[PDB]
Amino acid sequence: NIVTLTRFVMEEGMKARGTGEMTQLLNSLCTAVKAISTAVRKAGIAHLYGIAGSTNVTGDQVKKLDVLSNDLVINVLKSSFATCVLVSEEDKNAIIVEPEKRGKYVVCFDPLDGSSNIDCLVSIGTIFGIYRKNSTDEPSEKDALQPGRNLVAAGYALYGSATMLVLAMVNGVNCFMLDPAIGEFILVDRDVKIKKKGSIYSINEGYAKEFDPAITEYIQRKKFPPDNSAPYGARYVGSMVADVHRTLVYGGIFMYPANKKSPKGKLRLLYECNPMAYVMEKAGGLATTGKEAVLDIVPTDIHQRAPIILGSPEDVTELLEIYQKHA
Amino acid sequence: NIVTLTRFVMEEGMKARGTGEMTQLLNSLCTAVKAISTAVRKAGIAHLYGIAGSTNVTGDQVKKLDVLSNDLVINVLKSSFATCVLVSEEDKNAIIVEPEKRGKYVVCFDPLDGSSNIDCLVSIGTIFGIYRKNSTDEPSEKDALQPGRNLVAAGYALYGSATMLVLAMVNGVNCFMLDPAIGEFILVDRDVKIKKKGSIYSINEGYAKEFDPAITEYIQRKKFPPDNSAPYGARYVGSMVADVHRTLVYGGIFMYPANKKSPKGKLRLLYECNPMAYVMEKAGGLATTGKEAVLDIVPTDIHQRAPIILGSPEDVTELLEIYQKHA
Amino acid sequence: NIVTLTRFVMEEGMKARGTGEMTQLLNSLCTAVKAISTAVRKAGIAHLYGIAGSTNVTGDQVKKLDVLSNDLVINVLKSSFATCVLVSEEDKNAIIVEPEKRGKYVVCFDPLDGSSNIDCLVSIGTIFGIYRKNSTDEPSEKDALQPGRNLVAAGYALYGSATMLVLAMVNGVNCFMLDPAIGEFILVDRDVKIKKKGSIYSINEGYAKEFDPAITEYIQRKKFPPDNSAPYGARYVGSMVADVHRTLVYGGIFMYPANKKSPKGKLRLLYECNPMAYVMEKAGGLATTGKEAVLDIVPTDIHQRAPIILGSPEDVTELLEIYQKHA
Amino acid sequence: NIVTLTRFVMEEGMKARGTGEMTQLLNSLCTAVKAISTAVRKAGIAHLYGIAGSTNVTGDQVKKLDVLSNDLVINVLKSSFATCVLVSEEDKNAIIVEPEKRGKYVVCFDPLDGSSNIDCLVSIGTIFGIYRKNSTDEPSEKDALQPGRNLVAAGYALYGSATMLVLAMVNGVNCFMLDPAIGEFILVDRDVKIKKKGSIYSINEGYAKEFDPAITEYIQRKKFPPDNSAPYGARYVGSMVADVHRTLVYGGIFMYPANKKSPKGKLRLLYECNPMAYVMEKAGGLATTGKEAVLDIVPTDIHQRAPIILGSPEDVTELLEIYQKHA
Ligand SMILES: O=P(O)(O)OC[C@H]1O[C@](O)(CO)[C@@H](O)[C@@H]1O
Ligand SMILES: O=P(O)(O)OC[C@H]1O[C@](O)(CO)[C@@H](O)[C@@H]1O
Ligand SMILES: O=P(O)(O)OC[C@H]1O[C@](O)(CO)[C@@H](O)[C@@H]1O
Ligand SMILES: O=P(O)(O)OC[C@H]1O[C@](O)(CO)[C@@H](O)[C@@H]1O
Ligand SMILES: [Mg+2]
Ligand SMILES: [Mg+2]
Ligand SMILES: [Mg+2]
Ligand SMILES: [Mg+2]
Ligand SMILES: [Mg+2]
Ligand SMILES: [Mg+2]
Ligand SMILES: [Mg+2]
Ligand SMILES: [Mg+2]
């Protein structure tokens, strides 16, 4: 049995005696992600560069990748009839779905993450988290302000050497490779579980001067292991989706701690940190800010940042025991 | 007008009043890079997973990506009738072309580079360097022991968010985007030059304990600038092709020095360091061991390794200055 | 609202307060049809012709298109958990789905129709009809012996200049174009209705010598209109799916009447005639054998043939009034 | 070895000790045919239908397939710098290349042929015929009024179940399959020859009332063979490119004679009849008006029409014999 993601979600829904909305919702995301992937890989770029004389559409229009990505997600998500509140990294306000198309899901998303890496063609991705609305009020921003602990599903699509969609739900984590030949996601790793302990550490050490004593100490340990074991390898792609995906698949740890330009860290809680934390923990990993569990923070700003440290349970706890020691 | 690599290469050939072997070799490489790209993006992977039954080999009998890539490159290059000796990272010995397919060119390639990043879907790529044969005598592995300085052409294909072929010839570096919808590389940047000074450093800091004192000092400057300027950001994909390309386009520096565990460095002179060193110098940047230009090393072994430091000229110059100050 | 076929079927199922099986079933067919289309358009054919030296799979294997098509459908259909009996044109016996994977639907199909046209690259297609099982007995052949009047859904995918999936159900007929860039079928014509009267007639007139008086007379009329109107244009592609699709879209009429090599006509009732008749009639057209309604014939052999005349209501009735006149 | 059209064309050029303009023109055509093929198969059609919002023009402002095709062909051909005069079915007047892009070649093309079949998804295609300029004098429309006999190259791309480019040059006809996964046409049949005698006839019998007595008699022979052999099958896609290709590969005959409503026939001499006549004769078949070779007509108008009868030599010879018997 080849498992497609379309089959997988539908079977999931039929297990849960669902109304379907979530199936429709996840089918929408899949469509959006294939469309984003096709654009990310620059399909049709000959037309931008004049293969048919320009002409074509009459008056100036063209989109950056990030704008298209955002358009696809929002339109695809609305079309689902499964959502009521959308939080995109690109919209300073929560988007409230028009009643006609209103469903019960709230969706926080980064349509295209890793923007520093777009122009150099490095891996970038799409990140999403989904809540059920838990109010009877008019859907509004407040419905997106839930701790990540309430996520019913989250994951990301990585547009890398190949395109992979990682979906996490209450039961666990599954990876589906996009076969772009047939536009189908194929389950290739069922019930993914991160190694307890890794040998890779991923952080932007350019901020060394701004790190707290606890990060600084952990980093020296990765380099000069006190047990005089082999030092960890370093990897930082610079696109959270690639770096997090490699953490998931090879183990190790990823850090975006606080530093002065952000004391609250850089990464956004609702649509960067939370969905990654939910995937990590569903895979048997950890995601802490250094002081508290990421998924337990009750947000009060849909764009608030959080520091995040995530990955293998014994790497992350080793760091957390360092914070615990210094405090 | 839109410029395709096929047209470009062909005009370059016509200008030259060459015989056309170079042209045939490069159309060859293009065809191979597109065929590696489609396989890297995992097209038709659903057949591997049983979409059409025939379900026994969900394990490893079917070709790894590196073996397929190597086959594609060796085979396409042989059929161009333009080469006589080939050096692949994947074969212990130089391959000598059967006389019937013998051209005048020598090709040193890494069919898929970035192997540690293959399982996690991070960017990977293809690196080639092309020599004219110097000798009259029967072609042999010695024919490929020429300093990169003697390169007639070199470049790489990056299979990243999109696929890009970067080609550097005598008169400069050009970047061609692959539009996979029509199987055509489009000139997107012409006469590429790296910027004088970057703000990014790329090196695997996990080897901190093994770095010589100049690498050590230089890294300290990137994090704690003595003159109090902004610290450099850090980036390290873990795939030379991705980190190089990011250096070309955004500026900064890429480092893989010798370390006490690897004394002569890790990266292979003929089909990793030279081609990239050549690209870099053609783009106004530098590529050094820390003591001598990379392109000036006289290779004594086709699998010889070399330390390499490359990128913006002011950044590489600064570390060169550190090495001379350390004697 | 862009409508994908995945969304459309799911919304259909959620309207009908379904268990899902039919949604899972139609999602399976979609996947099969994209995979068939990708193969039909010869994606990967470079490998057949040695781009990477052969090698690849070790010992002889390769499939004809028709064999692959059949494999895809059967495996995809079984995987659905929605079927119990499958009738393929390629299997001399009905296929009884193993209990583990048994669903309640019976599916009759031509995985690849128009075989005379494959080697010359003309349009070919896939044809399907679906019944609910209407017995409590062990699923068996007899469950596939239902008149087409009991179909819950039928249609075809045409692999032509583009790939289109035409789905007919109790409510009517919808056309979805395959956008092979994202592997999604896009609803492009809702609730399709055939013109009452066409101006095209499609038949293999090479059998003129064997036609009954009624076909012969109608044909002379198409050529020499008794009202001295412009004669009908003639089109016969030779692949029922193309010819029928053009009948549906432009109107007119298609005939595969009885002749000596077949007195019962050539086309197979269960998986050629019936699904096409169901589409035609759902679009406001007709499908007769010349004497009786195609969809009312109770089959007794899963491979039995029927003569078929179909298309615009006034063309078909004009022919039927000719049969009525001669009898 | 695998032979790509790019390699083939390039070797053909090298052999010739040509300047390379022919080579550049044909790489040009290849690039255009792949770009028409991808658009014909409807890639990215979901953007036209609102997948990313921007929903106003679901009507006709965006480019018809024929206009896009024409733009692609004119533009790509101009940029090859190998042509001086172009004749497109879509432009009333010959197009004269601006001096800066002037080569030595004259191209007569039908960018998309098969227009009546475009809406129903039946096969369609691209037909080109390439002349050397005969004159010294400023290029003009007269430069394209040369008998097909003077053709240096001609062929067609069929966008059928798969896309195939058929190219006929002085030394014969070769068929190249497009593998759209890597954007590469693969030589699949070399030195193609049509069979002596076929069993298929292709003609639009709707004009029966307008056919001269020789066409009339010949058709009667196909259906009721005087010598009691098996009647010919009939086939008529309605797209010259598809019906021709089927004639090339399976043998038989294709007919578009003059009829009283169209006295000089329907098909255009320069960019429908000639190129196909040339292909046919290069493959050992014939192409006649019924009274003279098609390739020997001296065109007096770039949009001149001509009756054409083509295919297996014995089949065409037999109808020629009928015409001479009718005076
Ligand atoms: O350049 P920095 O500070 O290392 O930030 C990189 C981070 O920025 C982001 O693009 C912001 O989302 C993340 O993908 C990534 O991890
Ligand atoms: O794990 P490390 O030592 O940092 O290796 C990274 C290097 O490994 C390689 O894959 C070796 O070829 C390069 O692509 C890359 O630069
Ligand atoms: O060659 P003939 O007798 O005209 O038969 C053509 C018919 O054969 C089939 O391939 C048999 O399915 C149909 O697609 C088509 O209509
Ligand atoms: O409807 P008719 O007259 O049979 O026309 C068919 C001919 O029309 C054309 O489209 C005219 O270009 C050809 O492709 C085809 O052979
Ligand atoms: Mg973003
Ligand atoms: Mg982001
Ligand atoms: Mg390698
Ligand atoms: Mg390598
Ligand atoms: Mg079949
Ligand atoms: Mg059939
Ligand atoms: Mg045309
Ligand atoms: Mg035409």
XYZ file of N, CA and C in Angstrom, chain D residues 194-202 218 232 246-254 280 286 310-316:
87
model
N 8.273 5.465 -44.825
C 6.886 5.063 -44.776
C 6.712 3.727 -45.479
N 5.716 2.960 -45.099
C 5.560 1.711 -45.845
C 4.959 1.923 -47.208
N 5.310 1.015 -48.114
C 4.869 1.071 -49.517
C 3.370 1.218 -49.673
N 2.623 0.439 -48.934
C 1.192 0.414 -49.006
C 0.571 0.365 -47.636
N -0.411 1.181 -47.416
C -1.127 1.198 -46.188
C -2.482 0.583 -46.331
N -3.199 0.534 -45.237
C -4.559 0.106 -45.127
C -5.514 1.107 -44.496
N -5.107 2.351 -44.443
C -5.884 3.426 -43.878
C -6.076 4.590 -44.872
N -7.281 5.126 -44.948
C -7.457 6.353 -45.724
C -8.013 7.449 -44.789
N -7.543 8.678 -45.021
C -7.899 9.788 -44.164
C -8.387 10.968 -45.007
N -11.965 6.683 -56.021
C -10.930 6.129 -55.102
C -11.517 5.771 -53.765
N -10.192 -0.649 -46.592
C -9.303 0.182 -45.768
C -10.044 0.682 -44.552
N 0.229 9.960 -38.383
C -0.336 8.619 -38.405
C -0.130 7.973 -39.767
N 0.047 8.799 -40.794
C 0.265 8.284 -42.132
C 1.728 7.853 -42.274
N 2.616 8.698 -41.745
C 4.032 8.411 -41.718
C 4.274 7.062 -41.073
N 3.700 6.875 -39.901
C 4.076 5.734 -39.045
C 3.337 4.474 -39.394
N 2.051 4.571 -39.747
C 1.249 3.346 -40.036
C 1.059 3.097 -41.532
N 1.304 4.126 -42.363
C 1.152 4.018 -43.852
C -0.302 4.339 -44.237
N -0.605 4.329 -45.514
C -1.926 4.652 -45.925
C -1.901 5.987 -46.609
N -3.028 6.708 -46.574
C -3.077 7.928 -47.358
C -3.850 9.075 -46.618
N -3.430 10.307 -46.796
C -4.097 11.482 -46.286
C -4.523 12.403 -47.469
N 7.149 13.732 -46.243
C 6.688 12.523 -46.882
C 7.685 11.990 -47.944
N 4.799 10.052 -51.058
C 4.515 11.034 -52.135
C 3.523 12.035 -51.635
N -1.380 12.646 -49.874
C -0.038 12.204 -49.478
C -0.077 10.872 -48.793
N 1.112 10.246 -48.652
C 1.270 8.952 -47.988
C 1.969 7.844 -48.768
N 1.681 6.611 -48.425
C 2.385 5.514 -48.990
C 2.363 5.651 -50.477
N 3.478 5.330 -51.138
C 3.664 5.542 -52.606
C 2.711 4.760 -53.476
N 2.425 3.519 -53.107
C 1.434 2.704 -53.858
C 0.015 3.218 -53.713
N -0.298 3.792 -52.555
C -1.638 4.304 -52.370
C -1.840 5.596 -53.140
N -0.822 6.446 -53.120
C -0.922 7.739 -53.808
C -0.858 7.462 -55.321
